[PDB]
Design a protein around this ligand. Sequence first.
Ligand SMILES: [Zn+2]
Ligand SMILES: [Zn+2]
Ligand SMILES: [Zn+2]
Lengths: 74, 56, 186, 107, 71, 192, 74, 123, 119, 93
Amino acid sequence: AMVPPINCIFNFLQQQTPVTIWLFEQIGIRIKGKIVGFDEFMNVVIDEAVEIPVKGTPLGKILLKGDNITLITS
Amino acid sequence: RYYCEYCHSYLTHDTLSVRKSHLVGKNHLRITADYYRNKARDIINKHNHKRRHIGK
Amino acid sequence: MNYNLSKYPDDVSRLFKPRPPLSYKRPTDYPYAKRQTNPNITGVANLLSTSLKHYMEEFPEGSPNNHLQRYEDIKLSKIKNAQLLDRRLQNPNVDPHIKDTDPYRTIFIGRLPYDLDEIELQKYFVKFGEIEKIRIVKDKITQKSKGYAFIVFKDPISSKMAFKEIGVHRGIQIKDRICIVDIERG
Amino acid sequence: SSQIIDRPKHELSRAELEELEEFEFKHGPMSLINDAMVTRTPVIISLRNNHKIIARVKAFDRHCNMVLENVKELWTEKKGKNVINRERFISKLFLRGDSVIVVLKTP
Amino acid sequence: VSTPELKKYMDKKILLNINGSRKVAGILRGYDIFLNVVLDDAMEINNNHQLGLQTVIRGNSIISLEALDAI
Amino acid sequence: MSTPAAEQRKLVEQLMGLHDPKICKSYLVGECPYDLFQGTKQSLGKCPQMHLTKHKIQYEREVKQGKTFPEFEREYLAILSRFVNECNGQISVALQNLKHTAEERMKIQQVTEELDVLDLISKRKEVAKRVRNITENVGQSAQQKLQVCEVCGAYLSRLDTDRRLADHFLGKIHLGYVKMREDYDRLMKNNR
Amino acid sequence: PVNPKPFLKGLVNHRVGVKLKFNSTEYRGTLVSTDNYFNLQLNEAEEFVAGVSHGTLGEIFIRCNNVLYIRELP
Amino acid sequence: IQVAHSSRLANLIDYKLRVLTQDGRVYIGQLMAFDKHMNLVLNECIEERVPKTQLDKLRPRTTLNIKVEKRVLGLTILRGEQILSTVVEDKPLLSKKERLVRDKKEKKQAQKQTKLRKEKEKK
Amino acid sequence: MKLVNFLKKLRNEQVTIELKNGTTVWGTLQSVSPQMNAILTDVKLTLPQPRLNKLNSNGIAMASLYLTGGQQPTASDNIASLQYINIRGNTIRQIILPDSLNLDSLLVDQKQLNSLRRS
Amino acid sequence: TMNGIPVKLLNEAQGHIVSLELTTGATYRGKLVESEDSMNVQLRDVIATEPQGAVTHMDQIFVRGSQIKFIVVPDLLKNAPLFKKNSSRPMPP
RNA sequence: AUACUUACCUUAAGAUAUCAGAGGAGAGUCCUACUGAUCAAACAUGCGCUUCCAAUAGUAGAAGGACGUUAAGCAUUUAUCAUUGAACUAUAAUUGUUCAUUGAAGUCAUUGAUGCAAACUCCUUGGUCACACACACAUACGGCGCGGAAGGCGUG
RNA sequence: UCUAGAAAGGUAUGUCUAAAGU
Ligand SMILES: [Zn+2]
Ligand SMILES: [Zn+2]
Ligand SMILES: [Zn+2]
């Protein structure tokens, strides 16, 4: 059956699986961590997020703004 | 609502499942084919001649 | 463009031939990967040290915001008149002219006619029981008939029959006005 | 208060829409611009095209488009190691608000 | 408002060009009112390298949706 | 709604013990019969118990690995059984309506006059008059030619092709009621 | 399970840091309030273009569409 | 050409607009429809551009001649996100008095059409 | 407050609209649409040279300024002069108001005043 | 809501050869199967020109509606009924 | 035309110019074939208002095109990489150089593409009107014929 | 506690029934 995208994001939330979030292309950073929550706008909150460029810094618990996500992969 | 301009018949709340079923209705297809045959026939059959600019 | 997916008979889809395909001419702008507004937008803490002083020494005091104070004037008017209406509205055991006998016997009738008389108001109210006192209310600033009155019946069961009868029937037909009736409410 | 923030915006009525806008200006993030409109302090705006402006705010709006006065634009330009600083004075100005980044309030 | 008409493209392989430059292939499973899509077994067509066991593409950055399968 | 973020908000808010009357357990097992017939002409109204997706995917997890709660099965079987027996009564009413057409009075007297007209070469005359009476019964059929769809109870016909039948059999009514009959056959085999 | 709107309601009067998406210019300070569109006023703010503190800003207002991540700070 | 000062885009139907867009392209075509989002329907439009090579000739310092690529497109509809400005170029094929005559004649024909349709469906 | 209802009151006033590209439009303002679609009558389109020797102007806006068609050709700088331009709303960065106008009568919002008074 | 003449005209061209250029530069051209209300189109048996010119072929494509720059419908839809200015609708239901 | 069967579906809210005054209906609202001013539209009707409207006393001419020809015009500039073999300058994923295998994908075009200039041919458009074949002008030029197209401004 | 009566159509579809000669 059809698995809607908010259901897949909530699945990623509920099994606490580590995701990797691709941002806009000319920004140049990807963020890796576990999704804790979201809204209807696809803005997400991540716990123990580590950004990497294209070994990277730790960020703590960020609110990634949902205007900027391209792709959320596990 | 919706209104089939070719058909000349109204319709209730414009849902794509009603509208798409109208747009492949056999009677709508006859009305549309008549409309476009007549409009192509009118633009072929219309002899518009250039205005005459008679010099002395 | 030889065999058609269109429902119309091949006759009708000879009419809907497109134009020939569009010629290819190379693009003149930035591709979709490289499209961005300018990054390297520099900071703003540079401005606050030097250039802010060169702004303030040129324009030391700002212009008056007069449309703002027109809004301020209407807001002071609303607040002030609310305070005065509250003061005069708050300040019935010290109204004398409503200080007759027990209150359940006193019926309130309002929207009474402007040119009416206390005698014909008495004749109307007496039909539902004996009245003890009447007092039509007049404006204390100038004695325009206020259109409301106080009618004291001898008993509260007699008073509530006048309310029932002459109040629920659309208004007691007095002179040329319909005066609805209820309890004293004070 | 809580009743207008908690609900979605399509369930409010018209008096609650206007009450919500007044609440959002008076107790919110645009209260910075409102305090600078009343208290006459100069603001420093960094537009998106790397022009910084410095002005006073005569009026604002829910979109952050604003009518300024005594505008002093300040931008920098360069091609390589050559670099200059430029300045333009505009008297009265309407700024379409989709280009703003950071409104600042001078101490 | 109006769901996109991707009832034909369900459970098939699909090649979509993310954001201009990039290009991703995968097995489509779900979609929403905005065109954000969720596709199983995503492999970024470049020597190509695979993304992960599930992805969810925000539909702001889909340009076209080519269907590799029969449909 | 009108803006798409409003509808998206509606969906995520309805996404975000597990017992009691608050949750329609019949939907929780699957395919609530007041949900499968919402818009159609056999509409029951609204499902009284609320439906919610967080509970449903928690049930998907629970019957994936945890356990099964058979009180949910017996409640669903009660609701399913009362609806299926009610529509069995209604298809009985529909074929009763075919019978009541078939035993109509003036048609029975007309076929009685033609069957008294049916009364070697005597057999050839009787067979010609009986084929005329067979065509009279078929003329009564050509007024109707109705069979009854055995699942949904609605009328059908055989003179019609397979394709307009295929137009019928992918309905909201017929797919919903096929799903009801299939869960009833499954639960009556499994409980017996 | 914390959504973004209660997260940002929880960060009021705490030292947070937003990151503008342009030049990695992050601003950090004490968040006074938030909007429904996630406009955010800060207070006692600092900026960092690339770890280069150009100064301390008094009161800033950072527009909704610009901010890339908002993060809590120790 | 001179266009009336109070003439919005609703009034310029059947003019020959010259719609600029976000890329330097220009669609010289006859307007016949528009919308709330301002996405026009141009009748016979000709998408022009100035190439990357001849763009040096426009750079600030007889006349200057630029060779543009006229590419004929028949009955486009535009997407309104792209439009940047519209400039009127040419007046219509008809006058104003002739459009008045033709509009009264079309409305008369429509009212006769609805009269016959009503009196036919009542019969 | 919606501040476009301020811009509707400026009629027949010369403004100098800065666009998002960089090109500035100078003409008689006219009926402004509710989404800020400005209509200017007698415009003098121009595109400012960057006033550094090595630097470049906007290429897209330069080709656009030629393809308005009415570029007065023999002049040196990118100045095109035409009548009736119709600027789409989302492309105007800032509008330089005339100096002579009285803001203290223009910025009085009638609908806001009505909504504060009637409630 | 209401759609107006351009999106309704795009709905009038379901079935015929259209030619559309996306905002990334590409040009697709085929029979238009299903358009939608947000100019979200499908196209069958298309001839797909990449931006630098390399033309390929692909069976169906579903562009996002937001990426379209123009759509070139056939010529005869100039005579479509929705362009008629003085229309006389009979009666509501 | 009539009848029955089945499928699909059953509606975002509010308003119709503003300001101001007078009057009235139980502080604000509502109303006035009430009154002024402002704005807007239509219809008329005007300006010594501005711009434009093609030879026959000749075989011409203006504006716009050609997705027309000369024309393979004249001048430039391009045509995939790897693994190896034989040799090989050589920081590279033997790059450079000749020949081959194998391997990725691979718009066509090289009579092309880009720049420059000319000539010839062919389309579409209009008052091809009326009077005249003439000695004007510093306040530079009777703008003092009938119309038509487009805009400006004023009144009813 | 302030009195619950759900629509009635539209389009699409097949089949029956029928109306025509020279
Ligand atoms: Zn129709
Ligand atoms: Zn249920
Ligand atoms: Zn059935």
